[PDB]
Design a protein around this nucleic acid. Structure first.
Lengths: 85, 157
DNA sequence: CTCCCGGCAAATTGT
DNA sequence: TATAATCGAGCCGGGA
RNA sequence: AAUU
């Protein structure tokens, strides 16, 4: 019943999401270059804010404990970028 | 659908008693009122490039490929020539019958007028939009918002 | 009322 | 690692 | 399934 509450994608919608995901990974790659931050750490911080306050936990491969202190710092450092970055 | 901005300068000749003097014509505005039908005639010899808008038309005479004249036919003026037609100085291009006005989609900014005999020749500075349609396929995304302003080379889809 | 869960003897053997 | 695939298959007593 |  719960899966039947998410409608199936249109050919257009499928491509849009797939497209946005590819572009999004590419964005994270660039944010790594600009900032010098581990691509995974950036990815987990981005992902943290999307899913919401609900899910915040330590991620294995990452060197730093992932907690609201670090995600605010890292998100605030990302928002410290110039408009084109 | 991209409505492209075209700003040009095209001429027209009308009787003198039949035309209403204004410095500009808003679209739909009455340009002249003819007591009897009038034949607008060629002032150059050339091959005809006919460009028809929704209402109203543009007409362009060329020798070689170089345009020698640019004429504007407002509403109430029916082209008597077809694209690629050879014309000689003095042959009627369009008949103008009754009330002729600016078309609904096209304007007249500045209007200069010279008077010769019983006619006036208007040198019109005209601005109008020509629509072109593009079909967007499922694997394509439109990267431009509704009402955006684009120059040559800007990506739409 | 209805339903939902807990009970329902002992020891022994044998394929 | 790439056609496309998109929702399963016994009777009995007592206490909320 | 037997035995008591």
């Amino acid at each position: 019943h719960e899966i039947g509450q998410v409608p199936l994608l249109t050919l257009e919608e499928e491509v849009e999401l797939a497209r946005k995901v590819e572009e999004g990974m590419e964005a994270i790659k660039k944010l790594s270059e600009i900032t010098g931050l581990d691509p995974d750490l950036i990815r987990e911080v981005v992902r943290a804010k999307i899913l919401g306050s609900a899910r915040v936990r330590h991620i294995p491969g990452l060197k730093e404990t992932l907690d609201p202190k670090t995600v605010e710092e890292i998100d605030q450092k990302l928002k410290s970028l110039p408009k084109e970055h | 659908r991209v409505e492209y901005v075209k700003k040009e300068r095209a001429g027209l000749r009308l009787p003198l008693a039949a035309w209403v003097e204004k410095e500009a014509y808003k679209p739909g505005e009455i340009l002249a009122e003819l007591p009897e039908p009038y034949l607008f005639r060629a002032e150059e010899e050339g091959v005809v490039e006919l460009k028809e808008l929704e209402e109203g038309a543009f007409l362009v005479l060329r020798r070689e490929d170089e345009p020698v004249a640019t004429y504007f036919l407002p509403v109430g003026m029916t082209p008597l020539v077809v694209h690629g037609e050879i014309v000689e100085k003095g042959q009627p291009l369009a008949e103008a019958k009754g009330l002729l006005r600016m078309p609904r989609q096209v304007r007249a900014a500045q209007v200069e007028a010279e008077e010769e005999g019983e006619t006036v020749y208007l040198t019109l500075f005209l601005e109008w939009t020509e629509p072109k349609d593009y079909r967007v396929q499922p694997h394509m995304n439109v990267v431009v918002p509704e009402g955006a302003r684009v120059e040559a080379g800007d990506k739409i889809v």
